[PDB]
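Researcher: I'm comparing several assemblies side by side, and this is the next one on my list. It has 103 residues spread over two chains. Same procedure as the others: predict the full complex and return the structure.
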Amino acid sequence: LESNTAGDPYTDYEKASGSFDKAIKTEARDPLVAAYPIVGVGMEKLIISTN
Amino acid sequence: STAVQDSNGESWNTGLSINKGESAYINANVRYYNTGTAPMYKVTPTTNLVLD
């Protein structure tokens, strides 16, 4: 009843057939799983300039 | 009692002032090269300068 089962921009047929972006992990092939990056930022260290 | 006093004086001063956050103004001399198989138009790199 919905074009996108998961909610991600690619539709059911596009996700199933693999006619979408080729850098996406196979775990997102089936419609139930969603293509969703969780990009995060890891701090390494600060430098303080004393003016 | 009268008195007249003349005086001459000379002074030389030097002064060095410096900040502590903008203490220096490095700049680089670099050059781009290509080793792939296709030409690149409007090349712009993002590069990191690291000290140690």
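Model: For your comparison table: Chain B touches chain A through four residues (CB under 8 Å).
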